[PDB]
Amino acid sequence: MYVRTNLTILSPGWLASMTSADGTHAYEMQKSPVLLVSWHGKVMQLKVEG
Amino acid sequence: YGPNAKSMPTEEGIPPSANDLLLHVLEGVPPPGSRRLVVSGGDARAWLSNEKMYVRTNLTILSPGWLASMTSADGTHAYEMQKSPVLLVSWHGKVMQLKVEGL
Amino acid sequence: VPKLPCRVDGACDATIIKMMTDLNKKGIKVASVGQNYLISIPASALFADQSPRLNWASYSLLNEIAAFLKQFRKIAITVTSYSSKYVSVKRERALTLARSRVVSEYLWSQGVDSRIIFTQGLGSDKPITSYTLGGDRSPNARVEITFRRAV
Amino acid sequence: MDYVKPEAPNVTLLPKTKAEKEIWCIYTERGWKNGIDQANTILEENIARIKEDFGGMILYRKLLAMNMVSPPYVSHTDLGVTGDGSEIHIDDRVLRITALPELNVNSAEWRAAVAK
Amino acid sequence: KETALSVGAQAGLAWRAKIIDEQLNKQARNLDAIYDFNSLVLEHNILPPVLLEGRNTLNLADAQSIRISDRTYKVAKQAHFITTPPTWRQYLWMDYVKPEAPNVTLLPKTKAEKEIWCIYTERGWKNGIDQANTILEENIARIKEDFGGMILYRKLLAMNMVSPPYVSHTDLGVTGDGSEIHIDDRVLRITALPELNVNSAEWRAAVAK
Amino acid sequence: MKFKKPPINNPSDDATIKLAEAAVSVSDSMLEMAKVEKVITPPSKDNTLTIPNAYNLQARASVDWSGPIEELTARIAKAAHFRFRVLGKSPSVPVLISISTKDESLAEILRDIDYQAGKKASIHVYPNSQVVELRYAKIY
Amino acid sequence: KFKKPPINNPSDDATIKLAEAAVSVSDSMLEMAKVEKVITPPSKDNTLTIPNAYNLQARASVDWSGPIEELTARIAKAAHFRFRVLGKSPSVPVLISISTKDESLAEILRDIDYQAGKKASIHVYPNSQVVELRYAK
Amino acid sequence: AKVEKVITPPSKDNTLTIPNAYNLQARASVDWSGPIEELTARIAKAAHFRFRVL
Amino acid sequence: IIKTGDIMFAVLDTSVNSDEPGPILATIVTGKLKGSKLIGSFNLPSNADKMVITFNTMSIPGAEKTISISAYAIDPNTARTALASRTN
Amino acid sequence: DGCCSKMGGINYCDSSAGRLVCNNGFYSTCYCTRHAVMDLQFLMGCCLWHGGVYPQLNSSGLVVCNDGYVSEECSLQK
């Protein structure tokens, strides 16, 4: 799975994690149905699906 | 990317696994280009190659912090660490200090 | 190398042989098996009649055996206490446990070196001799210390 | 404390007579006292520094008990076997921490306490 | 002084070298008996390669970043052809030469010079002793590593963890001109080097009794 | 009234101590190698079927040979008064067998020889024809 | 009177440990060789039996390095046996090198077939005094 | 540390008990580092047990 | 590379009187340079209480080169600049 | 150096133990090799528990350690 966002990730962990200068991140990892996304110091959960 | 480009992307990856020299340390083979040291305090051997101490023993080091550890199948251990003239170890519940010369 | 100790401090094998000779002259049993050591003391020279009260003169021989035990370098020592069968198994088991506890506490109070002190009381379960005529005068009323000299 | 025995006895001008030898002795005594006090000062500063370290550690522990700081958090991953035909690694796991501890500016998440 | 130190070091090193070579010469048959090589060779006279295994490897790359590997295996020395089995003499035997050149420029004048010359000779003797012991220790460690790599290749080949070597032999009959003739040309090439399998099927388990 | 532990040998050598310390480790690794390989490989056949015992084979020997097999088995055939037989061609690389044993039968010597040879050669016997045959490895 | 001790006896702890470890590694590697060695049953072996007629008992000193058919026909001529082939000879000749000073013709042909291996075979009949070659298919 | 450490009671511990069968009392020297399935099939074959995976 | 002003040792064989000029050779007996030899000459002092040897032409084996280091000599185990001769 | 007294005298040094073995069958107390367990808990030397003494040549009397620590107590002041 490849993801483009501007927030951080906590539980699943990337396999690679690059970012641009302005604050856009591109992460890549193995496919997990659940994501732990961090933003502004707080934590939320995302449910991904096919 | 243009020739006038302000910034380059940030790149990372998997951290490195281990050094290849540590296996020769586990065998007791000194690495090429290194030189032998002096160990005082018990059963331990030491070498210096690239501003890093490499030590083969079977005890457990305490004080100065090490960068890498390798384990045999027989309790023999190899440590890659910073240069330090002194070492702290625990032998059988007793605390011992090791003096290293040649640094 | 002059800062390095050529010998271990406070070691003289001639003194070791001298105090072992004096111990066997006093009659307390001392045995060495390879690198293991077992010392047995009769309780009649140590306690009162079936009671864990210590005679004041026994502390001299306690100092002597502590000075002997200062010599070796070891990690774990074990004390066991044997006695006779008097009223119940419970009574003499408790008495042996208390005697071993008190002598172990005194040995830790003295400056002997170990990491582990194990103490056990067994009473009259393993007689070393079938001659059970006497009571505390019978030689099986005893205390044993065992350890292994490690390098 | 680092200790090296010094071996540098050198005199520029020797004290000639008894009076200057006497003042040489008393100034040696003054230097002895000054070196003693200097070593005590350095030791006291080391004591203060390590007290600072342990106090900061226990202050963080008490603050996390008070729910004033964010706990740290670490992502962990693990893969299968890897490596080339010459070198292989059986289980490869990687732990990178992501959430550093920091204070939380919102006040309502702070639980008080009461002893007895 | 310094010359006494150097000649004492030379004498001690040569003396210890002759002593240890004498001991190695005396203990002959059990040495090469325990260090076999010809029993470990392969079908087509190829030297088996060298393996290494480490366990529980941890690398702190920096702060906030650690990596744990369970078991690591290394191909150290690659397999190749051979003509004769190796022995222990190219791994353990010590060089010997007696330095027979006492070119004395510092002639002993006084007994103080003689005695400090004696004690410098003593510490040079000791330095030669420990130097020879260090060299012998490095030698025996290296040959232990070599034998361990050989037996590790044997074990991981028996455990179906490595690929066997593959060698093709091509056979031709008579060849050459009317002045040179070869009877039966036979050329065999090892096409496939041994390597470690990575799939989940080749793994083989064992249990003792 | 003095004290003494029993074992008092001649004084030792540090390099021999290091040699034995290495050798016990190598022996342990090789021993667990042998155990696990024995576990994963059940045996199939015994070489007693290929070479059985016979009469006038019970003369004994103590030997020390570390060279080619051919002169050794020629000496064996001369002792046994059996006719020598060779099948196949010797390879360019010689077959080297090192043997240090004592007081065993000719049958045991030959069985140890063929076990040490393995896949390079084999030994057959026909006491009915009183012949002893060495067959080389036909390979490539 | 003086039963002398063994001279090169291991009178040291290092020596007895070394020799005992050598004994252990010798026996264990011998067992490794025992479990790895593969043999053949003596009934199913691809070996040429000896018909032991009197015409095959002659001796010769023969060195040869080359093909098979001319040598076998020459052997049949020397032993007064008819010789025939069966199948087809390969384009590459089957080359056999042998060298003997004194040997009998039956085991000479037995080692010839042993050198031949899989690609050819020889059947010898002493009733109708013939030798027959048979190539592979 | 005593108020911090929290552990499981033996009422709901998810640890597999010893089946105490006759044939499962053998001694073995085992080294393995790999997938579980081939190892447990090998153990079942050595102990003469049928083995399946769902 | 040789440090400025160090000390080596040699043995001279070609003896001469302080009367007529002549080349005199010594042979280096230790140190890093081994097998090297050195030809040179002498000087005459006004008073006969000492003597030094002008050593300038040093030859080293191995490579065909001829260095020209100028050096003087000292009496071993006396550490003085005198000469072993008679003055009467 | 007198170690196996009131015994048979010294026989040989167990190098694997780093310890002398007497002619009497016991392990002696004196050490022979430096690869042995001597309980050394005190030693001299400055810039310890650090990068060691920095080997650069400095005009001033201060001596620094390689890890950045300043060894002013090993240094002299005025």
Automatic annotation (TrEMBL), chain C:
Keywords: Membrane. The keyword Membrane applies. Residues 34-151 form the OmpA-like domain. GO terms for cellular component: membrane. The keyword Membrane applies. This is LphA (DotK). It comes from Legionella pneumophila. The lineage of its organism: Bacteria, Pseudomonadati, Pseudomonadota, Gammaproteobacteria, Legionellales. The gene is lphA. The chain holds residues 38 to 188 of 189 of the full protein.
From TrEMBL, chain E:
The keyword Signal applies. It comes from Legionella pneumophila. Keywords: Signal. The chain holds residues 60 to 268 of 303 of the full protein. This is DotC.
From TrEMBL, chain F:
InterPro entries: DotD, DotD_sf. Keywords: Lipoprotein, Signal. The keyword Signal applies. It comes from the Bacteria. This is DotD. It comes from Legionella pneumophila. The gene is dotD.
From TrEMBL, chain I:
The chain holds residues 862 to 949 of 1048 of the full protein. Belongs to the TrbI/VirB10 family. It is found in: Membrane. The lineage of its organism: Bacteria, Pseudomonadati, Pseudomonadota, Gammaproteobacteria, Legionellales. It comes from the Bacteria. This is IcmE protein.
